[PDB]
Coordinates of C-alpha atoms (C1' of nucleotides) and ligand atoms in Angstrom, one line a residue:
Chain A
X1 CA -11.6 -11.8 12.5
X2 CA -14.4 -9.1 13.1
X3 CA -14.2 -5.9 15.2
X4 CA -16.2 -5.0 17.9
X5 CA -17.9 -1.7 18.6
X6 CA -15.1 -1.1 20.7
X7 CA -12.7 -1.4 18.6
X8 CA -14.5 0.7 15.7
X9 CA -14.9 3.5 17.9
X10 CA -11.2 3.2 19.1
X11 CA -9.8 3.2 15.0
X12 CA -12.7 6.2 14.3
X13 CA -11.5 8.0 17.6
X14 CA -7.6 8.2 16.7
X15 CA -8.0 8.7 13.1
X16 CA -10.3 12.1 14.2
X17 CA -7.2 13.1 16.5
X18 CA -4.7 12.2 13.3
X19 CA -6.6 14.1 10.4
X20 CA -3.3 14.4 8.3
X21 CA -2.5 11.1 8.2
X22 CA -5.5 9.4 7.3
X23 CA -4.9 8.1 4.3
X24 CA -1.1 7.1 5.8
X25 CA 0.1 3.3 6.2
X26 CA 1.9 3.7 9.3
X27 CA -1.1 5.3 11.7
X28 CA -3.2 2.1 11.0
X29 CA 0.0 0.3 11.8
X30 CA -0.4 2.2 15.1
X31 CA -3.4 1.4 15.8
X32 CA -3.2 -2.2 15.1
X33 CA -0.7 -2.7 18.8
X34 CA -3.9 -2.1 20.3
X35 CA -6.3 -4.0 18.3
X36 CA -5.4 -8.4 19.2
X37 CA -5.6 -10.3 15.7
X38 CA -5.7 -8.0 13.5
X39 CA -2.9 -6.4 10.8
X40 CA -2.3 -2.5 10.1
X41 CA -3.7 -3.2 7.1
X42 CA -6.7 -5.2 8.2
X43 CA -7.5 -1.1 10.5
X44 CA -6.7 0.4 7.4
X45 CA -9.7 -1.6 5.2
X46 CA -12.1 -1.6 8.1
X47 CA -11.7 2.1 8.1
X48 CA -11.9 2.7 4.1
X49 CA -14.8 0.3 3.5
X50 CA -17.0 0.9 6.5
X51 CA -15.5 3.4 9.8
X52 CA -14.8 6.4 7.4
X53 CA -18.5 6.7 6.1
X54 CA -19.6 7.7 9.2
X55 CA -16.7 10.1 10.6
X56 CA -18.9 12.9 11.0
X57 CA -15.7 15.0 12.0
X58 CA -12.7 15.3 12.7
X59 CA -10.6 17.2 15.6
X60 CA -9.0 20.8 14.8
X61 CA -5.0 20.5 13.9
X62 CA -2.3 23.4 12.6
X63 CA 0.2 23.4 10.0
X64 CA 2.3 20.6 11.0
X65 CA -0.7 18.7 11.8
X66 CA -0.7 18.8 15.6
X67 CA -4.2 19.3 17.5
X68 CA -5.3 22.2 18.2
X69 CA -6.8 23.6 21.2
X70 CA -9.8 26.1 22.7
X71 CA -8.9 28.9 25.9
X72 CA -10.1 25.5 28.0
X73 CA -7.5 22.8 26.4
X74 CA -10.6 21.2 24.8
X75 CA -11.0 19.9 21.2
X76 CA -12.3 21.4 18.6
X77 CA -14.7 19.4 16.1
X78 CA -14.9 20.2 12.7
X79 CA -15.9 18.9 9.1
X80 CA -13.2 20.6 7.0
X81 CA -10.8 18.1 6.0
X82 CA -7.3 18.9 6.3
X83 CA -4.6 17.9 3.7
X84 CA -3.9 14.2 3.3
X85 CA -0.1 14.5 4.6
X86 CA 1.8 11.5 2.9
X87 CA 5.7 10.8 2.4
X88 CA 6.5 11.4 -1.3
X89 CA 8.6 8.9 -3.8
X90 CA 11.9 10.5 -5.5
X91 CA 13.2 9.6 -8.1
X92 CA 15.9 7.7 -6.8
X93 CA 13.8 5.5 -4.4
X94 CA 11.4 4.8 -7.8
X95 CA 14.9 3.9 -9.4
X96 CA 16.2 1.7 -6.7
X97 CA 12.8 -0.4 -6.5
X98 CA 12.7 -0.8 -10.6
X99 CA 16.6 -2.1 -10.2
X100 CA 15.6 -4.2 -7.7
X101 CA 12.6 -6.0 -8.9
X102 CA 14.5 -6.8 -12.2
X103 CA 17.1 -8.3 -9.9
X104 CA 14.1 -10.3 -8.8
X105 CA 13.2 -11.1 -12.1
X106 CA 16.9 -12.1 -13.6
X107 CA 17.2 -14.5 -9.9
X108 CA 14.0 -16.3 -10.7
X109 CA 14.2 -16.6 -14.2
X110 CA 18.4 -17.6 -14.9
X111 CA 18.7 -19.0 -11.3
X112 CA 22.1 -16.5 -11.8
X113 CA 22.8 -14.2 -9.1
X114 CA 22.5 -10.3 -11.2
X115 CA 25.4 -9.0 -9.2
X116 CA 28.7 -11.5 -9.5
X117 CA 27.4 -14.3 -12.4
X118 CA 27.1 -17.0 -9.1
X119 CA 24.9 -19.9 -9.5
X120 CA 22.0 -19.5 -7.5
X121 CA 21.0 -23.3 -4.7
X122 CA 17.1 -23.7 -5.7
X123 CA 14.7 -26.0 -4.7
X124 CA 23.7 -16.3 -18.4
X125 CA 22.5 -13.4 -20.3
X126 CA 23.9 -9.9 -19.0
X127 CA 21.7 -8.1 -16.6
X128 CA 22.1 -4.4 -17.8
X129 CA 20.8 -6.2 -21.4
X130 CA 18.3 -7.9 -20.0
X131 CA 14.7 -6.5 -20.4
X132 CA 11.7 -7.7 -17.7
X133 CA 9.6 -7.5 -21.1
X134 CA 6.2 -7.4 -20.1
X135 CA 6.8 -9.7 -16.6
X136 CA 4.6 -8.5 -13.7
X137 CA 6.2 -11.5 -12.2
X138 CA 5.4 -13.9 -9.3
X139 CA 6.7 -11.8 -6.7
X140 CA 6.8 -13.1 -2.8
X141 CA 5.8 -11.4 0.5
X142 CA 8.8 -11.4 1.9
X143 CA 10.3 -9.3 -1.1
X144 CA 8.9 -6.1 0.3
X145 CA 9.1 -7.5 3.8
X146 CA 13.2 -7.3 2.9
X147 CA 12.9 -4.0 1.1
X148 CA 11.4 -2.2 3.3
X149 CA 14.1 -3.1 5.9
X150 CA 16.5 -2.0 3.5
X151 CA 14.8 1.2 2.6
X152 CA 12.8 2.0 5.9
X153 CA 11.5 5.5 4.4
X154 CA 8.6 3.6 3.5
X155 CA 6.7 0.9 4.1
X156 CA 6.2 -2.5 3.0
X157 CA 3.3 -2.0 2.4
X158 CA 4.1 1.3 0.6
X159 CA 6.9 -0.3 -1.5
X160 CA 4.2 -2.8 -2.7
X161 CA 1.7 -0.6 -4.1
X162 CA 4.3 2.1 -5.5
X163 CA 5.4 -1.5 -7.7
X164 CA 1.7 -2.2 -8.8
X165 CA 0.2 1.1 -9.4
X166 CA 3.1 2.9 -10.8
X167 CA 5.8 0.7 -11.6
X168 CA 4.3 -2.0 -13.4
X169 CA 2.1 0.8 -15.8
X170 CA 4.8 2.8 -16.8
X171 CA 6.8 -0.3 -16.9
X172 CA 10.7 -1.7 -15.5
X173 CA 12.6 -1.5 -18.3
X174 CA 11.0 1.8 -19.8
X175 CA 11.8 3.5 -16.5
X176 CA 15.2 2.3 -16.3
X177 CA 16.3 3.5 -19.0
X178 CA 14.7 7.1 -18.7
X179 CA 16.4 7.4 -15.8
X180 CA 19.3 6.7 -16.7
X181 CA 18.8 8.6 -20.0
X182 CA 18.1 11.6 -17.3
X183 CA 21.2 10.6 -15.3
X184 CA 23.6 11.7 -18.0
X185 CA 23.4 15.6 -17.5
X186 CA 20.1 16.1 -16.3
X187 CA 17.9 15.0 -13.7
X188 CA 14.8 12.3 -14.2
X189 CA 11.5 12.7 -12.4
X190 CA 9.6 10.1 -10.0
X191 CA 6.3 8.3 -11.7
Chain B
dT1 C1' -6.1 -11.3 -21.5
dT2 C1' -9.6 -13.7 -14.2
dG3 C1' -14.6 -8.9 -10.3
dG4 C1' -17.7 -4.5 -8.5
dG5 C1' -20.0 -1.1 -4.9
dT6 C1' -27.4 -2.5 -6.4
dG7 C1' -23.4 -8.2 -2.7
dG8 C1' -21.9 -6.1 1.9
dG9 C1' -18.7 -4.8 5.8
dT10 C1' -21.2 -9.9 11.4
dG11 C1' -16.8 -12.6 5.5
dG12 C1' -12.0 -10.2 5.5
dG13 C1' -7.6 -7.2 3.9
dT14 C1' -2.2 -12.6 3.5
dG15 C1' -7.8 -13.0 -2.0
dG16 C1' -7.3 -8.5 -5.1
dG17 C1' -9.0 -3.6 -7.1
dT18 C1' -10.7 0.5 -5.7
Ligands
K1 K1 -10.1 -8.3 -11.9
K2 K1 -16.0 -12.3 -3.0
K3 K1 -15.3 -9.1 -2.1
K4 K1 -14.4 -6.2 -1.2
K5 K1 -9.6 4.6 -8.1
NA6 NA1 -13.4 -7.7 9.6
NA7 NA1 -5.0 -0.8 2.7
NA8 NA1 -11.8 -2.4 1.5
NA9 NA1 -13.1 -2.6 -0.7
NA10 NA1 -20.6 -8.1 -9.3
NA11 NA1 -22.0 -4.1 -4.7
NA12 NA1 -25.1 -3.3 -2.7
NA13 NA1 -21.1 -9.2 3.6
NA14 NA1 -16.8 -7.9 6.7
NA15 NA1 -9.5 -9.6 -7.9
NA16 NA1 -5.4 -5.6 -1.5

DNA sequence: TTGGGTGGGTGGGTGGGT
């Protein structure tokens, strides 16, 4: 659906009082409660394609990113641009995700559960030897949907692009076995 | 190995890249 003027001034008026978390999932998220039909996601492209090329400022915040006031309790405007706070990806949760998604993979290609050899109900090959190959996969909604509620440090929405931008280039089965490699005395570093 | 920003944001972000 469209937006409104109200509605444009409403997503431009909290992203001013939340500088820090701009380019953050979870404040359009926030935002979308109040705004009827539309997706945090749906804010979040409004915002990048059209809202955010007439910001003009933003409001005054400190280190932690909370607003910052005048002697009078006012706002203060301003056109510096504070840092783009985002929650980082460790290694472990880039491990996880690439373990996962060959799971995925293994399900929808042998119809074997990876995890006890079961026959999967649809409508052989052992898994640590199995390579995804060059597979980006058909991968459904609702695999993120589930991840997410499994690992609720990020997003959906989050997990999904941290699988296309990163993990698909530097690749599943290359990244598994680096970490691992890294696993056996040392540590391995996130994409 | 099937998109770009001179197509445009009143077309929309579950259509996808950026
Ligand atoms: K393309
Ligand atoms: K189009
Ligand atoms: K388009
Ligand atoms: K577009
Ligand atoms: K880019
Ligand atoms: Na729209
Ligand atoms: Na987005
Ligand atoms: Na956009
Ligand atoms: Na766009
Ligand atoms: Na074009
Ligand atoms: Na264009
Ligand atoms: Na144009
Ligand atoms: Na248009
Ligand atoms: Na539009
Ligand atoms: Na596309
Ligand atoms: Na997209």
């Amino acid at each position: 659906a469209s937006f409104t003027d109200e509605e444009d001034e409403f997503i431009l008026d909290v992203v001013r009082k939340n500088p820090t978390r701009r380019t953050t999932h979870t404040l359009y998220d926030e935002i979308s409660h109040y705004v009827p039909n539309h997706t945090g996601n749906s804010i979040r492209h409004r915002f990048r394609v059209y809202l955010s090329k007439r910001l003009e400022y933003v409001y005054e915040v400190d280190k932690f990113g909370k607003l910052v006031r005048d002697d009078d309790g006012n706002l203060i405007k301003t056109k510096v641009l504070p840092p783009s706070i985002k929650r980082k990806f460790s290694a472990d949760e880039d491990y996880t995700l690439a373990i996962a998604v060959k799971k995925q993979f293994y399900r929808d290609l042998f119809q074997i559960d990876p995890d006890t050899g079961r026959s999967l109900i649809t409508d052989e090959p052992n898994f640590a030897a199995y390579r995804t190959q060059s597979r980006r996969g058909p991968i459904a909604r609702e695999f993120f949907k589930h991840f997410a509620e499994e690992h609720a440090a990020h997003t959906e929405n989050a997990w999904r692009d941290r699988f296309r931008k990163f993990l698909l280039a530097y690749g599943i089965d290359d990244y598994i076995s680096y970490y691992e490699a890294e696993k056996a005395q040392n540590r391995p570093e996130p994409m």
